[PDB]
Every structure is written in C-alpha cells, then in structure tokens.
C-alpha cells in the first residue's frame, strides 16, 4: 500500500547521517504523502509498480570495464556515480578543468525548491551527498561536464533505489554545457531518483542535456530546477528513452529581465511503458523570451504524458512565451494525455501554446513509398524527421549519433 | 453553511431524482481553491451568504421591458417557476411541451459536479420539450429567465431545469435568455440537457445577461447520436461570477459539433467557461472557439477537456481559445486537457494571450480614427467570428449591443 512505500523510504532515511536540510524534506515528504489517481497531477501516471514493492538501498562497485561498456563516447570532464554514490576512482580529475567540484553533504547554500512535490522531497531526503559544481565569473570550460549515473537492481523481487543530487552555479558571464547520463548496469529493475538544480547568473549561458537511458523495467523520478537572473541564457534538452515508468520535471524561474530560455524534451514509450515529461515556468520579470518544444512518439501499449504550466506574473511586460507539444501515435493501442496550461497576469505579452495528436498520415508515407522505400524505412525516416528539431540541438556530432542510435532502438524494425 | 442552507431549501414533494442529486451534493461537498477545477473561480462571495427562495410575480410590461426583440415561441420563467400567464402557447407550435416534475425519462449526467447536483435538486419543475420526427418548427424556441434579488443582505436563489429531445430528422433552434429584474443580487442555477437523435440538427444559443452583482452557475449536456449536427453558441455577459459548463457526448458516427463561447469580464468579475467533450464513436468532427476580452481587474477562466475513446478512428477535433487582455490588472487562466486513445485521428488545441498592439492604435490615430473608435473596431473584429454565427440579424444586433456595454466608452 501507499503508506508501506512511505514507511520503507522513511526506514531507509533513518537507516547514515542526514543533514538538517534532508530532515526538512523528509518532514515535507510525510506531510505531502503519496497521491492517488484522483490527484490533479497524477491521473495518468501509475505508481502501483513502485508502491507495491519492497525496497533496498545497496551501493555496489563496478570496474572501469563495466563503466566503459555503458559509457558515451565523448571528450568530457566525466564524474561517475554508482548506486547513489560518487566514485573517485572512476572519475576524471577536475582541477584546472574550469569546473570547481566538491562532493559532500553540506547543504547550507542550496536554494529553495521552485515547485515542491513528493518525489522531489524523496530525492532530497535520501540522497547521501550533493555534487557542488561551480564555474567562476567569465569562465568557459573547454570540455562539457558529464555526470554519468550507473544504477543496478538486485536479484530477486526487491527493488534497489538510488537518489542523486547535484547543484551547479554558473557565475556571471560563465558559459558551460552539462550532460546528465543515466544507465542501468543490467536488466534488474531499480528505482532511480534524481535532482539537478542550476543557478544561472547575469550574462551566463547554460546548455543542459539529459539522457535518461535506463533499462525497460526501472522507475525514474526526477525534478530539476533552473533559476535564471537577468541577461541570462539557458537551454535544456531531455531525451527520455529508458525505464518502464519515468516522470521528469523541469521547474524554472525567470527572476531577471532580458533572459532567454528554451526547454525541450523527447519521449518515446513502447511496450507498456509510461513516459511523463513535465515543466513549470514562472516569468517573474518581464522582457524574457521562452520557447518549449516537447515531442512524443508512442508505440504499442505505451502512454506519453505531457504537463506544462506557464505563469506570467503581474507587470512582467514584454514576456514572449511559447509552448508546443506534438504527439505521434503509432498503433491502435497507444495513448497520450496532454495538459499545456497558462496563468497570465500581464497584458503586454505574447503567450501561446499548442498541442497536436495524430499518426503518420498515409499521404506523407505515400511519397516515400512511391520512390520504392519500404514501409519500415519510410516510417523511420518520418520519425527521425519528426524528432530532428530536437536532435539537431545537439552540437557534438558524435553525441548526436549516439542519441539517434538510442532513438533507433524504439523505431519500427529497430 | 451553504450546504446546510441549500439542504433546507430542498426540504422546504421532491422527486426521487432530485433527492438523489441532493444526496450526491452533500456527499461531494463544496470544493476549495486546491481542487483541480477550482483554482481560479472564487466561491467566497457566494458561500458566505444567506439564501432564500422567493417566487416573485411579474407583469407583462416588466417582461416586455427585459425581453429580446424576436419572433419566437417564448416560454417565460420567473424566480425558478414557469409562468403560463406570460408565456406563449406551445400547443400547435411545432414543439411538444409538458411542464411538470416527472424526471424518469431524463438521461444520466455526462459529467457530475457540485453545481449540477444543486440545480437538479432545487429545480421546482422540468420543462419537457420535444420536436417530433422529421419536423422543423417555424419559429425558434425562446426560454426567457427572469430572476430577481430581495432587499437586504439575503441572496435569492432560483434553479432552472429544461430538457429538449430532437427526434430523428428533427431540426430546431433554441435560445436561453437570462436577465435580472433589477440591481439586486441573486444566485441563478441552470441546467439545459439536450438529446439529438440520428439525423437531427440542433442550434443552441445561450445569452447570460444578468446584472453585475449576481452569480450564475450552469451545466448543459448535449448528447448526439449518428449523422447528427449540433452548434452551441454562448454569450456570457452578465453576473459578478459566472461559471458555465457544456458537457457533450458524441455517441454516433458521422456527426458534427461546434461549441463556441464569448466571455468579457470587466470590473472585478470572473467569467469561467468550460467544456467537456467525449468522442465516443469515430468519424465525428468537433470544433470549438472560445474567445475572451478581459478588462482591468477582470478574470477569464477557460477549461476544455477532450477525450477520444479507443477505436474512435477518423476523429477530427479542434479547440481554440484566444484571449485579449485590455489592462495591466487583467487576468486569464486557460487549461485544455487532451486524453487521446486512438491513433487514426486529427486532434489539436491552441491558446493565445495578448493585447492590442499600440502600433495598431497609433496607425489608426494617424489615419483619423481616435482611440475609442479604434479600440471598439478592433474588439468587435475580435468577437466577429463568434457574433457572425447568429443567423437572425435582429438578434445579432442585440447581442452586439450587450457587448458594446463592456467596451471602452460603452
């Protein structure tokens, strides 16, 4: 039952040395509790597979070879985390990289949550350490920072759970690209929780990429926060291509004028999967431009869920915000639920949103088939083209090809 | 204390159906600002009031003073009660009408909710309307509602209930008209349910034109069979707080549906326009256009749910909500909810929020058109796609006049 899952997580919390901040989030976890399908934000995302499980929290050890077999081919400053723990022996040295990094459980400097919710509190409470990352004023690291997360399940019916917590501060004029990569060690199911919070100061430029590529049976529940000051730029691209049930939130505050924001995501549930991609955006100051593109491709008995809220505060004049959610359904058993929302309290603004749902039109495939292209190839071409606005945002070609290959595994004919 | 008072109004006999809705009402209770569907619609101004139920008497002169200029089959309702002395003959009009409190033939609600239950439980009678197979009445049916408040702090409440059945091949236009007798505040509840049979064609128009201080909470149901057509146009231009729901089921193939609404909250008004639509069978086309014009300190709320059932192939459904904000303290909250369980469909939703660009005003000013005339032209143009739906030119002008009262210098 619901209380049982909470009881077990509560037990794991008290198993350890918890910070005052994690204690506060534990209290909030218990005050908020777990939701039912009647809750406003949980009508379409099942928790039964999680709630009815017995949990464990074991931190294993892997070799360099096991890391390499799961790793992305990319020139980066790579930090490796295994079953909720930073592993120095598998990580790159950070001194002189342009990234100031300290892993510890001191949380006095972390900002408050933008949008509190149950799984954010769970991850805050259970994470055993925080990855404190900082890029100093005007610094532009030569290589992107890669956060590689390797989580494994245990044999039997128990569900191993690992919760990761990182914070990045980009000081004024700093420019950096950070990549989150999540993989499973094997086919055993696990429950991954994650929370990456980022502060972007004046004139700073952030490029954030999330690659959620865990196995087909696991649960992935994450909530990232983006806090932007004035004259700031932030782009976040999420490729949610792993897990049986995944629910990712990106909450953002535009707390300064003249900033630019883009938040995109791709979801491609297959089999009996549920992929839930959500955003919460607050235009608290005027003169900011935001653009969101969330595309989904749903096959088999899959279900994609989109939720996007944009709140424009009073007097946030010259706000220019757009949100688009395009959903492609493949097959008569596919499902998609979408709720793009607007709360607009300023008049001198340009705000709009749109959501579309359909399948590959016979008319579009007709012109590929007329050239002799077979059905599966034609469908793959159309799907890649549908995802192209999102995958073309990946500057590194090598990285882009790897993401395209992960997409390829979910296409008709693979 | 609202529930307790409403409960007492009920027991003050009542049909078993009304008893069932009251039971559900008390079981569901009143929602808070934390409820999924009530984040933006205030109930304080209503909940913290003392309710009464007084059925006042009105003269034909008072009726004519508030009545629309239109040739129709007019039925007049005053303070929750049908008034035969002020109504037209229905016998021989093309509309089979029976007014009583028998409710065994009424269909189940498409989307049960608190205020629908309240209106079902408190309505004192049901207007049973039917158009026989293949028939097309010469004049439209007009349901005119006249509600008045009482002197003092008490809030008079009146709940209206009507059901229209369009038999196979039947075609009809029905208009709901709501007005206030004077400036006194009242609480109006309404529920118009309509069954559209195979090959039947419905034209529904709602004109909610009550005073600035009243509360109007309504919920209409539209049920369509196969090869049916239904167009519903709502002009929500009255009340301090208005919340109108239209719930619809497309339960037959090859049907066409259009649901439009106009909302223009001013002062400190809240105008909440909501739709719930189920494409239960395939091959149906649905289109919705909801436009709002929000003045300073006003608040418009839009909520539109579209659910497309599994195997409802060839569904073609669109929903558009355009919002024009006219001042720095205007507010708009808009929430579509698409639940699509069929792949071979074309479904989309779009919403826009913005204001009149100063450059457009300046351009007009440079061409000899002043600010007020420029604003009025632009606002009327924004509402035009909705107002042009009114076939009767005489009726369209009266609606445009009501719109005009809310424009700069109106």
Curated annotation (Swiss-Prot), chain A:
GO CC annotation terms, alphabetical: iron-sulfur cluster assembly complex
Assembly and interaction partners: Part of the SufBCD complex that contains SufB, SufC and SufD. Can form homodimers.
GO terms under biological process: iron-sulfur cluster assembly; response to oxidative stress
Gene coding for it: sufD
InterPro entries to which the protein is assigned, alphabetical: Fe-S_cluster_assembly_SufBD (IPR055346), SUF_FeS_clus_asmbl_SufBD_core (IPR000825), SUF_FeS_clus_asmbl_SufBD_sf (IPR037284), SUF_FeS_clus_asmbl_SufD (IPR011542)
Domain of life: Bacteria
Stated family: Belongs to the iron-sulfur cluster assembly SufBD family.
Annotated function: The SufBCD complex acts synergistically with SufE to stimulate the cysteine desulfurase activity of SufS. The SufBCD complex contributes to the assembly or repair of oxygen-labile iron-sulfur clusters under oxidative stress. May facilitate iron uptake from extracellular iron chelators under iron limitation. Required for the stability of the FhuF protein.
The protein, known as: Iron-sulfur cluster assembly protein SufD
Lineage: Bacteria, Pseudomonadati, Pseudomonadota, Gammaproteobacteria, Enterobacterales
UniProtKB/Swiss-Prot annotation, chain B:
Cellular component, GO, one term: iron-sulfur cluster assembly complex
Name of a matching Pfam family: SUFBD_core
Biological process, per Gene Ontology: iron-sulfur cluster assembly; response to oxidative stress
Assembly behavior: Part of the SufBCD complex that contains SufB, SufC and SufD. Can form homodimers.
Function: The SufBCD complex acts synergistically with SufE to stimulate the cysteine desulfurase activity of SufS. The SufBCD complex contributes to the assembly or repair of oxygen-labile iron-sulfur clusters under oxidative stress. May facilitate iron uptake from extracellular iron chelators under iron limitation. Required for the stability of the FhuF protein.
Family from the record: Belongs to the iron-sulfur cluster assembly SufBD family.
Record PANTHER family: PROTEIN ABCI7, CHLOROPLASTIC (PTHR43575:SF1)
Name of the protein in its database record: Iron-sulfur cluster assembly protein SufD
Organism: Escherichia coli (strain K12)
Upper classification of the organism: Bacteria, Pseudomonadati, Pseudomonadota, Gammaproteobacteria, Enterobacterales
Gene name, Swiss-Prot/TrEMBL: sufD
